[PDB]
Amino acid sequence: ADTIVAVELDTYPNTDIGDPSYPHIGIDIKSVRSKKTAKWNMQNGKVGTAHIIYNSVDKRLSAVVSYPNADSATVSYDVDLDNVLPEWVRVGLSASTGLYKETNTILSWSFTSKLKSETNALHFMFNQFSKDQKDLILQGDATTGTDGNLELTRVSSNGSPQGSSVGRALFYAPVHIWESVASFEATFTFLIKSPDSHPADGIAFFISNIDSSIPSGSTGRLLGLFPDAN
Amino acid sequence: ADTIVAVELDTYPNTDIGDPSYPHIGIDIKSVRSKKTAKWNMQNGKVGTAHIIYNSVDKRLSAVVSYPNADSATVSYDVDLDNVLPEWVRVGLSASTGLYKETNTILSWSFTSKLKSETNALHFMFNQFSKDQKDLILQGDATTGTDGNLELTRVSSNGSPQGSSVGRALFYAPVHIWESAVVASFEATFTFLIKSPDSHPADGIAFFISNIDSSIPSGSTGRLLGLFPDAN
Amino acid sequence: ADTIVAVELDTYPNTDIGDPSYPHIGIDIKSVRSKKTAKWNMQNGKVGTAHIIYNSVDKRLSAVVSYPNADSATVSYDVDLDNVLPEWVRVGLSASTGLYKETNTILSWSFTSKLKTNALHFMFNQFSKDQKDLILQGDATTGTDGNLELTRVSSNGSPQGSSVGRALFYAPVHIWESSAVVASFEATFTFLIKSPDSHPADGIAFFISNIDSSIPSGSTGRLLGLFPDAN
Amino acid sequence: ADTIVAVELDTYPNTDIGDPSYPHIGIDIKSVRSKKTAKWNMQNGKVGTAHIIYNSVDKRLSAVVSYPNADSATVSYDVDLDNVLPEWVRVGLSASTGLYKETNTILSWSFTSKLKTNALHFMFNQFSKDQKDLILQGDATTGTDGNLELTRVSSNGSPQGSSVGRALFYAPVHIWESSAVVASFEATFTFLIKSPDSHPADGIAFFISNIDSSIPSGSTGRLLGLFPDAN
Ligand SMILES: OC[C@H]1O[C@H](OCc2cn[nH]n2)[C@@H](O)[C@@H](O)[C@@H]1O
Ligand SMILES: OC[C@H]1O[C@H](OCc2cn[nH]n2)[C@@H](O)[C@@H](O)[C@@H]1O
Numbered sequence A: 001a002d003t004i005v006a007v008e009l010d011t012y013p014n015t016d017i018g019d020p021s022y023p024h025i026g027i028d029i030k031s032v033r034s035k036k037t038a039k040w041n042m043q044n045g046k047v048g049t050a051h052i053i054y055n056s057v058d059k060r061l062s063a064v065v066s067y068p069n070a071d072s073a074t075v076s077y078d079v080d081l082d083n084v085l086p087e088w089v090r091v092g093l094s095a096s097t098g099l100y101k102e103t104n105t106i107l108s109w110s111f112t113s114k115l116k117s118e119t120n121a122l123h124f125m126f127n128q129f130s131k132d133q134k135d136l137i138l139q140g141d142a143t144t145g146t147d148g149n150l151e152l153t154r155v156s157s158n159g160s161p162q163g164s165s166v167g168r169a170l171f172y173a174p175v176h177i178w179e180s181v182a183s184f185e186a187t188f189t190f191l192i193k194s195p196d197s198h199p200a201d202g203i204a205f206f207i208s209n210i211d212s213s214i215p216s217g218s219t220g221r222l223l224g225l226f227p228d229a230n
Numbered sequence B: 001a002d003t004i005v006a007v008e009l010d011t012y013p014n015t016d017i018g019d020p021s022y023p024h025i026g027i028d029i030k031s032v033r034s035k036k037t038a039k040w041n042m043q044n045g046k047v048g049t050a051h052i053i054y055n056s057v058d059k060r061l062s063a064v065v066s067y068p069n070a071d072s073a074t075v076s077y078d079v080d081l082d083n084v085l086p087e088w089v090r091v092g093l094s095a096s097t098g099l100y101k102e103t104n105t106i107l108s109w110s111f112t113s114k115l116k117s118e119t120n121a122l123h124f125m126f127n128q129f130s131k132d133q134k135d136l137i138l139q140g141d142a143t144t145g146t147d148g149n150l151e152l153t154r155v156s157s158n159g160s161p162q163g164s165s166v167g168r169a170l171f172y173a174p175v176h177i178w179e180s181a182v183v184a185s186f187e188a189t190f191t192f193l194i195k196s197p198d199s200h201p202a203d204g205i206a207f208f209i210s211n212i213d214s215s216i217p218s219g220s221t222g223r224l225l226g227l228f229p230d231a232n
Numbered sequence C, D: 001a002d003t004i005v006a007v008e009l010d011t012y013p014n015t016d017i018g019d020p021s022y023p024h025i026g027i028d029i030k031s032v033r034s035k036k037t038a039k040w041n042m043q044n045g046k047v048g049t050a051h052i053i054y055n056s057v058d059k060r061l062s063a064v065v066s067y068p069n070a071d072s073a074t075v076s077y078d079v080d081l082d083n084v085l086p087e088w089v090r091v092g093l094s095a096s097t098g099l100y101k102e103t104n105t106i107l108s109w110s111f112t113s114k115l116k117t118n119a120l121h122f123m124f125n126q127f128s129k130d131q132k133d134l135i136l137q138g139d140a141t142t143g144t145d146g147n148l149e150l151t152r153v154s155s156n157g158s159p160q161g162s163s164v165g166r167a168l169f170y171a172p173v174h175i176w177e178s179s180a181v182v183a184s185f186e187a188t189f190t191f192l193i194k195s196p197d198s199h200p201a202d203g204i205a206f207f208i209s210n211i212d213s214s215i216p217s218g219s220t221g222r223l224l225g226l227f228p229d230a231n
């Protein structure tokens, strides 16, 4: 079973398993039950910005989500990621739909990892995605090319999102993300678009065991990240 | 009077004005009396590294100081830099000797400011220093091009440091370091070599962020580290 | 008098002084008579891209000028920058109108110096009203739509003729040493040239000069804020 | 059979097959018979620096090899990389010994790819024993002194003859696209060739190939871990 650290963008509140009563960002450590959340005033059809940061000094996992000329949502939680995750990881985005649905649409994604024993580094930047985007490991329903974006869940030829969908995008190379100062910054832009009165289920940035894969039946409320609601 | 934010690498305990009784790091917000500090087992004649970090999400100004295969010292303080400094700053290193002295030798320095409204960026890297290093503003006793290093304080033609010295290096361009921001952030690193014949060296190195038009105050040698008008 | 290396987005054919008959890109080495040019189908009112590059191994100053979904214009030229420019320089953008006019809005500017390692990078995506890390010379202003207008624009948003302005980055840039294994720079910028005139004038240039460089008195029109005369 | 573009640090003159009469650097386009070479005074037991660069505007593959306080060696050649290599590639270092031998230890390695923007950068300043973001192939090991040993070294530190290894970075790299205003890469690395032989052999190269690229069976000695034969 995979070991998951994730920052979630949770559009659909599953109160029966812990979610607050509103859309919300939060920090997920080994569980879909967030260890901390904030209210996230999601904006249908609006392109948004997510930034995630962590360093081995403060060991504060932190993230912002915003739309232009609006109040951001902010969440942060103390984690020694070197204690929780393995030496090598992969970095990625995940998303899912259920009974309810939305487009889970990635217009850009960037990452920068620095380790200082002295310094090793990795950086990659996606402002567009192509149909055969060979430096991404695409899993589940994830495609690229159309147009020219990364789409995590299923969406029709005219742009209409489909329920009970799950997909992930992992950058191809593993990342050394702690050694016995270190830091990483992740940035992405997303476009959640839904005809439903309630959209679902949300996007996530995650860091996993190198050989992580979507768990069986992880559509909907489990975001492509988790075996179960535990 | 200049508005100073600083990370200090304090070699000489001046306990008459607040210092703990050991070499320490600390965070300096508008005062030479640190808001917080930690024990910095300084190593004489050893080349060490310093890394300073800050962001507008956590607003926690933090710094590490370390010598190869040894324990680093750590210090961090919660600070909304937008609330203390002006929009435009300049960023710098400073150092000072007094009765006691040391080489305050800079072997490398780097900086990265990111501000996201979207992104504006600033980076500069110094692995060596020429004699006419036109992108620094040298104040007081600071020279460049001996080895290819920045020397914040006075040192002889054969490398021997001198008492009652004070000097500063500042990068030429001013820096946007907060907007009214999705996220802002900066990282600063430098490598130093402190070397002294004294049994106690003094007074320390600082990394500093100031009003653009800041300079060394009158008589800020010693415990005042080139940064502060007074011991208040 | 200044030492100027410039790449020029020349919108107005001043054939009297060697311009081709059409709008051109061009490389400018101590003279407004470009040492080399190529043809640039400048699209009026379109945001374009430009990239400028050089290394001390090949010593080829090169430039691309582009509009989404159309063929780029390309120009390149062999010059030892160290034998022309002084050890320290400043970097900038310049623009001029004359009898005819155009807006010279800049939407973005970037730069990277490597000297081999010493390094320098700034990215401007948007410009504030008090953009303190830029030296503004002449008619140049910042803040309006968050951009850099090199030349004067009225409050109707329309361009005034016979104007000249420049933005230089505040920090001096070390652009060659005698002891370099490699040295290199990249410069990139986006612009927008909006003219109600039949023929817009006069163009944009990215430039590297002596640190103390200033707008040559009279440098409007064909002279692009760079050169005192047309020699 | 693999598609190979390489810049070769050729320590041994295999004159039988077009090597010059001295150690050289050189650009290898689908052949071990370098298209272009320059003389390189390789210094035994000393750390050196190699820089490799290309952009799609100039279409000029150039390379610099240097030692502190000695004249650099320089080589350069005109190739439209996109007419040679496929859309996607992997990047790497290769090395070989044959009858005579040298250590081929890499102290650091960097790379930057820019596609107009899509980008990729990695910096290796040190190599742990389980360096999972490198594909190791043949005799190559990591960790010992925190370094990358392309070829076999004994437990006394001595270089073994007739050896071959390669380090490819694990992520595919997109090194051209038909819709590129500008694409470019740079690669830097530091090496240390230590040989007790009168004549060290065979050399190090930085290479770009088809993503599925493998060591050619028998590619030791003069063939650098890159080419099936000397054709
Ligand atoms: O602004 C365009 C040009 O206007 C003026 O020249 C007009 C002209 C061209 N041929 N005959 N008259 C001058 O100001 C030039 O310097 C400008 O380039
Ligand atoms: O290792 C150096 C070379 O050794 C072998 O060739 C020996 C030789 C050359 N001329 N006469 N004998 C082969 O393995 C070559 O491929 C190597 O370059």
Ligand SMILES: [Ca+2]
Residues within 6 Å of the ligand: A010, A011, A012, A013, A014, A019, A201, A202, A221
């Ligand atoms: Ca949910």
Ligand SMILES: [Ca+2]
Residues within 6 Å of the ligand: B010, B011, B012, B013, B014, B019, B203, B204, B223
């Ligand atoms: Ca003190």
Ligand SMILES: [Ca+2]
Residues within 6 Å of the ligand: A117, A118, B048, B049, B066, B067, B068, B069
């Ligand atoms: Ca160290």
Ligand SMILES: [Ca+2]
Residues within 6 Å of the ligand: C010, C011, C012, C013, C014, C019, C202, C222
């Ligand atoms: Ca003209």
Ligand SMILES: [Ca+2]
Residues within 6 Å of the ligand: C048, C049, C066, C067, C068, D181
């Ligand atoms: Ca374009």
Ligand SMILES: [Ca+2]
Residues within 6 Å of the ligand: D010, D011, D012, D013, D014, D019, D202, D203, D222
């Ligand atoms: Ca050979």
Ligand SMILES: [Mn+2]
Residues within 6 Å of the ligand: A008, A010, A019, A026, A032, A034
């Ligand atoms: Mn949730």
Ligand SMILES: [Mn+2]
Residues within 6 Å of the ligand: B008, B010, B019, B026, B032, B034
């Ligand atoms: Mn103190």
Ligand SMILES: [Mn+2]
Residues within 6 Å of the ligand: C008, C010, C019, C024, C026, C032, C034
């Ligand atoms: Mn012209």
Ligand SMILES: [Mn+2]
Residues within 6 Å of the ligand: D008, D010, D019, D020, D026, D032, D034
């Ligand atoms: Mn050869």
